[PDB]
Paper text:
In mammals, the cleavage and polyadenylation specificity factor (CPSF) constitutes the core of the 3′ end processing machinery onto which the remaining factors, including cleavage stimulation factor (CstF) and poly(A) polymerase (PAP), assemble. These interactions are mediated by [name], a CPSF subunit characterized by high degree of intrinsic disorder. Here, we report two crystal structures revealing the interactions of human [name] ([name]) with [name] and CstF77. Taken together, these results provide a structural basis for the multivalent scaffolding and regulatory functions of [name] in 3′ end processing.
To gain insights into the [name]–[name] interaction, we determined a crystal structure of a [name] fragment spanning ZF4 and ZF5 domains (CPSF30ZF4–ZF5, residues 118–178) in complex with hFip1CD (residues 138–180 of [name] isoform 4) at a resolution of 2.2 Å. The structure reveals that hFip1CD binds [name] in a 2:1 stoichiometry, with one hFip1CD molecule (hFip1CDa) binding predominantly to ZF4 and the other (hFip1CDb) to ZF5. While the overall conformation of the [name]–[name] complex is highly similar to that of a recent crystal structure of human [name]–[name], with a root-mean-square deviation of 0.82 Å over the whole complex, in this study, 21 additional residues of [name] could be resolved in hFip1CDb due to extended crystallization construct boundaries, with 16 additional residues at the N-terminus (residues 130–145, isoform 4) and 5 additional residues at the C-terminus (residues 177–181, isoform 4). The hFip1CDa–[name] interaction surface (803 Å2) is almost twice as large as the hFip1CDb–[name] interface (478 Å2) because hFip1CDa binds at the ZF4–ZF5 junction and has additional contacts with ZF5. hFip1CDa and hFip1CDb also contact each other directly (215 Å2). ZF4 interaction with hFip1CDa is mediated by a hydrophobic interface centered on Lys127CPSF30 and Phe131CPSF30 and supported by additional salt-bridge contact involving Arg144CPSF30 and Asn159hFip1. In turn, the interaction of ZF5 with hFip1CDb is mainly mediated by Tyr151CPSF30 and Phe155CPSF30 and supported by a salt-bridge contact between Arg168CPSF30 and Asp159hFip1. Interactions with both ZF4 and ZF5 are mediated by a hydrophobic patch in hFip1CD comprising the aromatic side chains of Trp150hFip1, Phe161hFip1, and Trp170hFip1. Moreover, superpositions with [name] ZF2 and ZF3 domains reveal that the interaction surfaces on ZF4 and ZF5 are located on the opposite side of the ZF fold relative to the PAS RNA-binding surfaces of ZF2 and ZF3. We subsequently performed size-exclusion chromatography coupled to multiangle static light scattering (SEC-MALS) to analyze the stoichiometry of hFip1CD–CPSF30ZF4–ZF5 complexes. hFip1CD and wild-type CPSF30ZF4–ZF5 formed a 2:1 complex. In contrast, CPSF30ZF4–ZF5 proteins containing Y127ECPSF30 or F155ECPSF30 mutations formed a 1:1 complex with hFip1CD, while simultaneous mutation of both residues resulted in complete loss of binding.
Author numbering:
A (entry chain B): 147 to 184
B (entry chain C): 129 to 181
C (entry chain A): 122 to 170
The structure:
Amino acid sequence: DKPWRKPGADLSDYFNYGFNEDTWKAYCEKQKRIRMGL
Amino acid sequence: AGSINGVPLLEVDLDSFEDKPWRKPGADLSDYFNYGFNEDTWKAYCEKQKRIR
Amino acid sequence: KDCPWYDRGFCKHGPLCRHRHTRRVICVNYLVGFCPEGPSCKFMHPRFE
Ligand SMILES: [Zn+2]
Ligand SMILES: [Zn+2]
């Protein structure tokens, strides 16, 4: 479903700065919370 | 996770800086502050984060 | 050339993107919230627009 997730793929082609699937999602959550709330 | 020359980024005091180019009348504060922070909002964020941990 | 979505940090296409995906380094200090070097910083300040 998500083409970065296949062994024949290289994540770096999708994510910059050494992000991960989980680190990018975490980065988006932080964006969401910080810019609104707290 | 942040640090400036050996000081956690949240514990750095912005008032000590000699340049403070983020007070300029039209500067790109997005270059300096992420998440739409401001000098005051960043310090507030800082003071909030410190009271926790 | 440099991919705008990749420059933000993530591109849905990847190898199929029409633009180039220059690998860059992010500024941790900007990632936590503040970097005083601003435009002069060596490391990237990705906009989340
Ligand atoms: Zn792309
Ligand atoms: Zn920086």
